[PDB]
Design a protein around this motif. Sequence first.
Motif: not given
Lengths: 149, 77
Positions: B63-75
């Motif tokens: 999760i910490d990596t999946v939320l790492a994305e989104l965050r990194a993607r703008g979501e």
Amino acid sequence: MQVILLDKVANLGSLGDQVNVKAGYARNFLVPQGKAVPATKKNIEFFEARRAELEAKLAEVLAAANARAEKINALETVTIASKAGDEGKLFGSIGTRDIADAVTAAGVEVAKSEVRLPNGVLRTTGEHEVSFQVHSEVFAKVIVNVVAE
Amino acid sequence: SRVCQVTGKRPVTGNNRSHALNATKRRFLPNLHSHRFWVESEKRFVTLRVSAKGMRVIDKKGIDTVLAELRARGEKY
RNA sequence: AGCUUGACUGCGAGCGUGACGGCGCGAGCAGGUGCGAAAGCAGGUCAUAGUGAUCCGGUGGUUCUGAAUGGAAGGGCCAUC
RNA sequence: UUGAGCCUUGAUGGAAGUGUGGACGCCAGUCUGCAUGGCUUUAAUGUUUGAUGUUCUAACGUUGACCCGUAAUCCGGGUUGCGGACAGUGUCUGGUGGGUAGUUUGACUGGGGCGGUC
RNA sequence: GUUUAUUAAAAACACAGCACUGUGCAAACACGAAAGUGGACGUAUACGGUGUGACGCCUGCCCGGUGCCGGAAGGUUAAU
RNA sequence: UUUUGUAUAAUGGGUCAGCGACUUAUAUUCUGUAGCAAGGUUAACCGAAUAGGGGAGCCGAAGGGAAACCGAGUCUUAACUGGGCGUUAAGUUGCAGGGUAUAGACCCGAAACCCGGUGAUCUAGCCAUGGGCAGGUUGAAGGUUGGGUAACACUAACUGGAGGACCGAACCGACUAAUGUUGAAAAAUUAGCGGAUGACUUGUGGCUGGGGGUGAAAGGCCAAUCAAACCGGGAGAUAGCU
RNA sequence: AGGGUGACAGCCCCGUACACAAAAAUGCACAUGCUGUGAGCUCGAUGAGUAGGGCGGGACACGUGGUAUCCUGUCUGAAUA
RNA sequence: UAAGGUGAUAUGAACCGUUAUAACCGGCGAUUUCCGAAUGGGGAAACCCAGUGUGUUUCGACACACUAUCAUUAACUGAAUCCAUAGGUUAAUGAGGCGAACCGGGGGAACUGAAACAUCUAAGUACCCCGAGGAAAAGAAAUCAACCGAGAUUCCCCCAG
Ligand SMILES: [Mg+2]
Ligand SMILES: [Mg+2]
Ligand SMILES: [Mg+2]
Ligand SMILES: [Mg+2]
Ligand SMILES: [Mg+2]
Ligand SMILES: [Mg+2]
Ligand SMILES: [Mg+2]
Ligand SMILES: [Mg+2]
Ligand SMILES: [Mg+2]
Ligand SMILES: [Mg+2]
Ligand SMILES: [Mg+2]
Ligand SMILES: [Mg+2]
Ligand SMILES: [Mg+2]
Ligand SMILES: [Mg+2]
Ligand SMILES: [Mg+2]
Ligand SMILES: [Mg+2]
Ligand SMILES: [Mg+2]
Ligand SMILES: [Mg+2]
Ligand SMILES: [Mg+2]
Ligand SMILES: [Mg+2]
Ligand SMILES: [Mg+2]
Ligand SMILES: [Mg+2]
Ligand SMILES: [Mg+2]
Ligand SMILES: [Mg+2]
Ligand SMILES: [Mg+2]
Ligand SMILES: [Mg+2]
Ligand SMILES: [Mg+2]
Ligand SMILES: [Mg+2]
């Protein structure tokens, strides 16, 4: 979903064993509630390294004073004794600090009765070699010289 | 918007095909679910809208990596 | 009535009849066969109805084909459903 | 709880006397254990594997109550009560489905239809 | 009372009344890929569908067919 | 013009002038013509640009067989006395033309199908908020008082003012007739007619949108149109018909 | 070349061939400055819910076909020169 | 650049010029009401109504500026919960709307052809939608070939109807 354990854990638990559980039990209960962790390979050494830097490391770190009785393999100087009695036989006993009296200046000084032989402690000759509590495994060897006065 | 927040999985179009082989416009669409994930990294429940599979992805990547994305993607998340 | 499998296989000069697809008749040739002592006769039934194109697919046969090569799948060809 | 496998401790492949449940027991045995006295036909566990049933909570539902964002019948976070691996939804799948949709529904013929015919 | 505004005002539609039938409420039903909404700030003396059509006297027989309801055995039967 | 046949009382045209229908592209074959000839010719591109280069390639000089293969032969069959198709006639590239193919393919014309839009200023239904109903009748319940009963019941005057109640203007409608019918009017005028305190009538504003609405239900209404509105698009739909 | 001028103009007019031009703002080139920016060698590392697969679809000229190849809604899921 | 000028219908008037500030042309600036993305709120476009800052020998009031939304960042604040998140205000940057075709992507018909028609066609066409550039897209082989070899993508002619 294999994952490795932290705490015990009912029908599989074991402080770090290698289990394989239904994905739900894990991503719903085990993890996010501190009990397990994805077996992300990164981890199967991260929690296997310990299994070496411990179960084969600190289980060897124990062996640094073999038998603890190292250079005391030739008995110890008999300062006094441990008593006697019954005009020939024996009569007196060991106070809660009276097996040192003889070996009372060798290693380090203490004064406690971690009794090992739950008998009336045999009353005969004098010099004997049993063991005494030196640790949760090893032993030691010395003798006992009476006092003629 | 039936869109899986982790894998981008949105609905798609295809036909039906009868025995007669009769074309009929339809959609396949993701098996979404939205699920309360626990993070510990943030002491909170971030509750994503996720397609199973998305789930399987978190269950692997973390999760910490999946939320790492989104965050990194703008979501949002 | 006796013996039989010519209700044979490959062909076929040359005709009939159809817009066509096609259908019909045919002596004779090769191989092999039945009947007859022999000449000879037999490529079904006195003749004319008893039927379904093509595609797709099945079965047997056949190296003809076979996408690097050898095979195979599939395809062809012959037979048949 | 339960169908089946494996591991096992009791069945098929420190003496004699004063004493006990279950039994294909060749048709009348003797057993299988129960007290004592100077690889294949059998019972319980640990178990591995599926079925059934209880309950649990912790996914999930809440069109109960409360708290805050917030003077807000939305929404979000939080607490609580109720429910709970059910419900629901995705994919796949059998059924139903003139509700909706695309069409089909031949020719000849003393007009057409009917009859008849191909 | 309503109706074919513009060839039909009627015996057609509606009606109060009657019956059948669905619906325990996040109701059935309806608008809507959904969220949301009507039903209703209603709760079975209610809400929907269908038929009949004030009222009087009444409303018989038939469940084979079609439709609907119920059925924890077997037969047949999908993905898997 | 269409027909077996039209002076035909079968079609079209009031008349003039202007416009108005077999094309274009790419393939393909044939005839004509020109070049070259067992050969002919290049495409893109280069370019010194209508030259020249470029021969990639196309067609032709070889056919038979499903094919492997064989080859002026080849296939059929074990093999043909044989039989089928071939060997004996020049091609190819321009250019004009005749057909064909693909495109709207000679021109004009449907009723329609589909997409995206614009329409509840007409009208249906509903929502909010406002307005209107001259005049005249009938006299429900209830109430008061008498008479009456043992008491109620009952009964008589009065009082009261009910109703998709009566009659009738406004207002809403629209049953009959006449007139009108190149109208005063693409639905009216005139004389009669129904409703007229109600399921009434009306103003303003609002919401419901096309396989959709709305419908006390006629398939009615949704801007002089509705068995599926209008506008633009697909679009030169298609038209074996005229 | 072309246009105009009282009818048809090389020589009437404006042009045309040819040769020239920018105080300013810009375009593009280069040569430079500024901010950056990273250059070369050696030693490493070498793209997992991925490839593949079941199911349903869609793309490839290819209509599930004997059907490779590709995309994925759903369910699964390797190897590591 | 110049001896003529103040656009046109369209004169006339009052003027401006003739050696360089008449006019005419071009570069750069200034000004640029209201509506319109319209952006302070509203709204039946070109109208109505504000808040906060300012500003006057007449500092009533009336004129001038700023105040939309969203995203990134930053500062200051700041819940249920005490930390922390959420939330709140301010500020700096940016975005919005328009418009030919070409381009990439998300959806995607029917008439019609098959002489009917459903597989098939028309066709990924028309059309709707999102996005972008001077072009877009594609692109340095887990590509082909075939036992020789080739060497990204794009476009053209062939291969071949
Ligand atoms: Mg139908
Ligand atoms: Mg007929
Ligand atoms: Mg009436
Ligand atoms: Mg009428
Ligand atoms: Mg009438
Ligand atoms: Mg009812
Ligand atoms: Mg009736
Ligand atoms: Mg009746
Ligand atoms: Mg009855
Ligand atoms: Mg005639
Ligand atoms: Mg005549
Ligand atoms: Mg005439
Ligand atoms: Mg109105
Ligand atoms: Mg009345
Ligand atoms: Mg009246
Ligand atoms: Mg009248
Ligand atoms: Mg009718
Ligand atoms: Mg109308
Ligand atoms: Mg239209
Ligand atoms: Mg037309
Ligand atoms: Mg078309
Ligand atoms: Mg790699
Ligand atoms: Mg404004
Ligand atoms: Mg505004
Ligand atoms: Mg059609
Ligand atoms: Mg057709
Ligand atoms: Mg680019
Ligand atoms: Mg090589």
